[PDB]
Amino acid sequence: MNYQMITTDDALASLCEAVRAFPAIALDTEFVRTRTYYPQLGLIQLFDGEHLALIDPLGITDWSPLKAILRDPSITKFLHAGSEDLEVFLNVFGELPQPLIDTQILAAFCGRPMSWGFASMVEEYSGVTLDKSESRTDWLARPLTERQCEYAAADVWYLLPITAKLMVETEASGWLPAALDECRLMQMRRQEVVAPEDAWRDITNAWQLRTRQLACLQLLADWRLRKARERDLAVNFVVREEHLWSVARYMPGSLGELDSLGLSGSEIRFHGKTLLALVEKAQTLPEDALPQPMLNLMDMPGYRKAFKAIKSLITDVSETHKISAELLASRRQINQLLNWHWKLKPQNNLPELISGWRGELMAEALHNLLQEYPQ
Ligand SMILES: [Zn+2]
Ligand SMILES: [Zn+2]
Ligand SMILES: [Zn+2]
Ligand SMILES: [Zn+2]
Ligand SMILES: [Zn+2]
């Protein structure tokens, strides 16, 4: 297994010139989890069957050649368990590769766990036991060690042959259309960008607040997300989630009160004045500018009965179509459908359970079931 380190624009351009003739490439990335808002990318790996490249983002300035490869419809891009990879791709390229297929998703439609690990999959198809000794290392350290490079290279080297095997297995089972739609769905979700004004909607206990308190949370979460993106710090390193909620709930009027609420010395010295000003702003906001209270799905009449009924339906669909119930519907997706049914919150698209491949399988049954619960 021979790999090439690519750290210059010219080398990247040369690589892509050769790769463009191939029908598919295996991709992967390595990044570290720190306190930054955007993950710190340490490496991108690519393999077309002949060229195995380890691309060092620190040495690249012009990504154009690779972005061209990544959007080329004649080159199928493959990865395994790529949720985080999608995040990194959007941050460095501004767009996701297409067409892009995830072997973990293909395997799930073939009967494997939605969380089937790369090493396990490689063991199954190649009989090779991967070395995980370099999995949790510092991908930003330089130069990377030979062992690190080998680990990174193996993630695409062994993936390519498996992509061909799984594409055949998935097609042979009749689930390829569904698997590709599912891959598209994950990609669409990752592309969604949260506007600062909507940051509050993702705080899971925001529903417990009254109108004035919620107006405060909206302003606070908007400010925090913008600050996080400005400083490149995860939102909780700006102001802890619990602390931000407390400011919204208790509507403090002094720095002394922020201390009483538990905010740290750093949060107070850097953001105290701002937080208090946001509270005051919400306090003086005109009622016609206040947000509507949230409707806790769990407190809607019939919720528990409907949830149980849907779970039961999913089980029947699962046994009939010989597909995992977890793949058919997660708790998140069931709640998404019920939030839609009862119009408990704004949703951009139709619920996943009654759209795309899932809808084709059970939308009729789900709509029939929902007739038992008043909108
Ligand atoms: Zn060239
Ligand atoms: Zn080359
Ligand atoms: Zn990955
Ligand atoms: Zn990897
Ligand atoms: Zn500011």
The reported resolution of this PDB entry, expressed in Å, is 1.6
Catalytic residue list contains 181: no
Question: So what CATH class is 294-375?
Answer: mainly alpha
CA dihedral for 240, 244, 249, 251, sign (positive or negative) = positive
Q: How far apart are CA 22 and CA 48, in angstroms?
A: 7
Q: What is the DSSP string of 3-31?
A: -EEE-SHHHHHHHHHHHTTSSEEEEEEEE
Method by which the coordinates were obtained: X-ray
The domain limits of the chain are: 1-194, 195-293, 294-375
- Tracing tokens 């061209």 back to the chain, one arrives at 68
Q: Give the ligand with the smallest distance to the CA of 273.
A: 5
Q: How far is ligand 1, taken at its centre, from the CA of residue 118, in Å?
A: 33
For 1-194, CATH number?
Answer: 3.30.420.10
- Of 3, 30, 158, 182, the active-site residue reads 30
Per-residue burial over 97-109, b if 16 or more Cβ lie within 10 Å, else e, is: bebbbbbbbbbbb
Q: Which residues pair with 76 in a beta bridge?
A: 24
Catalytic residue list contains 28: yes
Q: Where are the alpha helices (DSSP H) in 158-264?
A: 159-172, 176-191, 211-231, 241-250, 255-260
Q: How far apart are CA 325 and CA 358, in angstroms?
A: 11
Judge if 195-293 and 294-375 fold alike in CATH terms. Answer: yes
Do residues 324 and 114 touch, judged by C-beta distance below 8 A?
yes
- Look up residue 319 and give its amino acid: E
Specify the pairing of strand 52-55 against strand 40-47: antiparallel
- Tracing tokens 């899971």 back to the chain, one arrives at 204
Q: Give the ligand with the smallest distance to the CA of 19.
A: 2
Residues 6+ apart with CB under 8 A from 356: 181, 182, 184, 185
Do residues 209 and 136 touch, judged by C-beta distance below 8 A?
no
Q: What is the DSSP string of 251-314?
A: ---SHHHHHHTT--HHHHHHHHHHHHHHHHHHHHS-GGGSPPPP--GGGSTTHHHHHHHHHHHH
Cis geometry, peptide bond prior to residue 351 (ω within 30 degrees of 0): no
Residues 6+ apart with CB under 8 A from 289: 215
- Tracing tokens 């000794």 back to the chain, one arrives at 133
How many helices (H) and strands (E) are present in the chain, helices listed first? 16, 6
Q: How far is ligand 1, taken at its centre, from the CA of residue 8, in Å?
A: 12
What does R_g of the chain's alpha carbons equal in angstroms?
24
Catalytic residue list contains 232: no
Q: Which residues pair with 53 in a beta bridge?
A: 4, 46
CB atoms within 10 A of CB 76: 18
Q: How far apart are CA 52 and CA 270, in angstroms?
A: 47
For 195-293, CATH number?
Answer: 1.10.150.80
Cis geometry, peptide bond prior to residue 113 (ω within 30 degrees of 0): no
Q: Give the ligand with the smallest distance to the CA of 5.
A: 2
